[PDB]
C-alpha cells in the first residue's frame, strides 16, 4: 500500500536511488480518516501486533474540558471554524487535531450557574453557602462570557479522531482565543 520508507526520495545530495528489496508490511501506511460531523460511525483498524486503533468518521459529540474551571463536559460539535493546515477542512467541516470548532456551551452554562449561582451575561441552604464561598472567583473572562450569549463555544481539538476514536478538545482561553479571534475577523 502506501509506503513511508525513505528508500525512494533522493538522498540529500540530489542522488536518485535504485530499488533494493520491496515494499514491506512494517513501512505501510493507510488512508486518512477525514472524519466529519454528526452520526457517530467508528471502524476498528487492526494495527501492528494486535492493537486495535479506532477510525472515526462522522462524529457528533466530544468531551471538552474547561481548562481554567477544572471540569470537562460532553458537548455537541456544531461546526469547524478555522484550521491552520487546510482551509478545505474548515469548509467541509472535517474533524482533526488543531482544528478550531464551535461546541455547545449549554452543559457549560448548566454547570456554571448551578456551581456559582451567577447566570452568565445579561434558594437552598447549603447552596447559598458555597455560592457565597465562591466569589472574586466567578469573574470568568470578557471573551469567555460573550460567547455564552450566542450559546456556542470556540474549542480546539487536542485529540486525533482518526487514531483514537474520540474528538476531544479544550475551550479556547485567554491568549489562544485572543489569537484565534484575530484571524477569525481578519478572515471573515
Partner RNA sequence: UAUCUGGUUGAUCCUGCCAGUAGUCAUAUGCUUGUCUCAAAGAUUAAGCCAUGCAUGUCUAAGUAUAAGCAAUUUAUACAGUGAAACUGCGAAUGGCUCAUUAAAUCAGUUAUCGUUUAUUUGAUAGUUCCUACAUGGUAUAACUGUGGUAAUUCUAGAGCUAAUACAUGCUUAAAAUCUCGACCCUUUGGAAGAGAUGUAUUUAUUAGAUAAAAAAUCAAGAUGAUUCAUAAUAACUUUUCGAAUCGCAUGGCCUUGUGCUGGCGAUGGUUCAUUCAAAUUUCUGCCCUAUCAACUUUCGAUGGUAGGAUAGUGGCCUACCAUGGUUUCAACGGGUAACGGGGAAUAAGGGUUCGAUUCCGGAGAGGGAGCCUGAGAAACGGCUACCA
Partner RNA sequence: GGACUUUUACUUUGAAAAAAUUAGAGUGUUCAAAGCAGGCGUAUUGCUCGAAUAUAUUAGCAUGGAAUAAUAGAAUAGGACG
Partner RNA sequence: GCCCGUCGCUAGUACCGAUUGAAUGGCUUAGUGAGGCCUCAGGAUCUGCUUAGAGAUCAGAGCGGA
* 96 to 135: interface string for RNA, x by CB under 7 A: xxx----------------x--------xxxx-xx--x-x
For RNA, the binding residue among 60, 61, 151, 184 (CB under 7 A) is 61
Restricting to residues 116-155, which ones interact with Mg ion according to CB under 5 A? none
Query: From Mg ion, RNA, another protein, none, which one binds at residue 90 (CB under 5 to 8 Å depending on kind)?
Result: Mg ion
Please count the other Cβ atoms lying within 10 Å of the Cβ belonging to residue 144: 23
Is the Cβ of residue 148 or residue 173 nearer to RNA in the bound state?
Answer: 173
Nearest alpha-carbon partner for 101 in 31, 158, 34: 158
Which of 44, 63, 119, 137 binds another protein (CB under 8 A)? It is 137
Counting residues that bind RNA (by CB under 7 A) gives 88
Q: Give the count of alpha carbons within 13 A of 151, CB side only.
A: 4
140 binds another protein (CB under 8 A): yes
Burial status of residue 83 (CB atoms within 10 A of its CB: 0-12, 13-18, 19 or more) = buried
Contact between 12 and RNA by CB under 7 A: the answer reads yes
Binding residues for another protein restricted to 54-113, rule: CB under 8 A? 67-68, 84-85, 98
Partner interacting with residue 61 (select from RNA, another protein, Mg ion, none; CB below 5-8 Å by kind):
RNA
Cβ 157 to another protein, closest distance in Å?
A: 13
Minimum CB distance to another protein, residue 167 (Å)? 18
φ, ψ for residue 142 (rounded to 5)?
-65, -40
Torsion of CA 133, 137, 142, 147, to 10 degrees: -60
33 binds RNA (CB under 7 A): yes
Q: List all residues 6 or more positions away from 163 whose beta carbon is below 8 Å from its beta carbon.
A: 53, 54
Q: What is the 8-class DSSP label of residue 21? A: S
SS3 at position 118 = coil
Chain positions contacting Mg ion, by CB under 5 A: 90
Amino acid at each position: 500500500g502506501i509506503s513511508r520508507d525513505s528508500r525512494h526520495k533522493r538522498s540529500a545530495t540530489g542522488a536518485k536511488r535504485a530499488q533494493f528489496r520491496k515494499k514491506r508490511k512494517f513501512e505501510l501506511g493507510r488512508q486518512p480518516a477525514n472524519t466529519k460531523i454528526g452520526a457517530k460511525r467508528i471502524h476498528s483498524v487492526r494495527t501492528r501486533g494486535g492493537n486495535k486503533k479506532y477510525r472515526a468518521l462522522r462524529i457528533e459529540t466530544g468531551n471538552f474540558s474547561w481548562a481554567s474551571e477544572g471540569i470537562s463536559k460532553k458537548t455537541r460539535i456544531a461546526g469547524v471554524v478555522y484550521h491552520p493546515s487546510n482551509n478545505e477542512l474548515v469548509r467541509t467541516n472535517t474533524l482533526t487535531k488543531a482544528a478550531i470548532v464551535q461546541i455547545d456551551a449549554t452543559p457549560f452554562r448548566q454547570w456554571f450557574e448551578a456551581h456559582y449561582g451567577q447566570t452568565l451575561g445579561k434558594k437552598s441552604k447549603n447552596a447559598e453557602r458555597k455560592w457565597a464561598a465562591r466569589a472574586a472567583s466567578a469573574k470568568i473572562e470578557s471573551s469567555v462570557e460573550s460567547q455564552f450569549s450566542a450559546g456556542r463555544l470556540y474549542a480546539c481539538i487536542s485529540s486525533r479522531p482518526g487514531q483514537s476514536g474520540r474528538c476531544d478538545g479544550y475551550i479556547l482561553e485567554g491568549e489562544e482565543l485572543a489569537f484565534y479571534l484575530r484571524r477569525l475577523t481578519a478572515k471573515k
